[PDB]
Write a protein that binds this DNA or RNA. Structure first.
Lengths: 89, 86, 86, 84
RNA sequence: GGUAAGAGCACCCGACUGCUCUUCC
RNA sequence: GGUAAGAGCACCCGACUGCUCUUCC
């Protein structure tokens, strides 16, 4: 799987996961997140770009969207989503 | 009629504020607007865009482009989502 | 598709702070940065750029793009100067 | 100095706005606003006031050039604007 | 989660007041 | 006698933003 799913863990967890994927020869990886984690996704990309691969990375695609989920009180709600496909240059 | 800025800066306010700003711009003959945000508010930015497109102007608005970045403060993430009617 | 940005924001601190930030970014491998400012600091933004291109990296840094604008406050002017390695 | 040039100094921005608009209203199609040092922001102000408040959808930013001059060093800006 | 009320730090736009310097009637 | 327009410095106030925090629902 070339997908890094952003969650509640510190951003460095996902940064290191992504870096590990890139170092293992995986040409293209996809960082995915929804709701509050969206900014963390962006962080994950930027750190990967700005701390470890200052030139060896490019953003292939950014896609945003929405999905309906049932909250912890059984109420249907819309949640934003983001996917960032990046690859080595 | 003076030309308003086509930029909606997402900040600390509720999403509805920015949805209303964006829709006000679009309804006043502005063809393309840019939603900008930094840090956690990036989520709000996305919310705003989605809320503007799928809910209140359906089938009329295109996401022209999405640009992410970093701003030196330490650093913080940035996003700019350019959308337009189509 | 747009290449992610790296922004240095200008304020009222001594110009060398911002020059330092810019040079640091450029030396780390970032090939293009954006110097942003609002109001009076616009002058300093220009300063930063010039100081970057004339004192440290002569014949290495070029101006990619200059954009001026306005933000509602009343109103304040804005500048963005994108510079790039030749 | 060319006749289509507005040089920014220490005067309130309204003066330079008025000079620019006077030129544009007298039939001059393109004008250039020039400034140096701290007045640079004022130059931008002038331009922004002219194209957004006085003549909406009629003025284009043709070109912006920044530079340096020796006095110490001072920054310079030139902003060429034109009618659509 | 909240058009619930506040707080600290950083960053930054603008203003008042005092002082210094420049340019007048 | 008048005290304007700028450039600095000090202090402070009012917004915007970023990052945390407290209480309340």
């Amino acid at each position: 799987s070339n997908v890094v799913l952003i969650g509640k863990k510190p951003v460095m967890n996902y940064v290191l996961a992504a870096l590990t994927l890139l170092n293992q020869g995986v040409s293209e990886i996809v960082i995915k997140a929804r709701g509050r984690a969206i900014s963390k996704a962006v962080d994950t990309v930027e750190i990967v770009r700005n701390r470890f691969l200052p030139d060896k990375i490019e953003i292939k695609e950014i896609r945003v969207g929405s999905q309906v989920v049932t909250s912890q009180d059984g109420r249907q709600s819309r949640v934003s989503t983001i996917e960032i496909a990046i690859r080595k240059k």
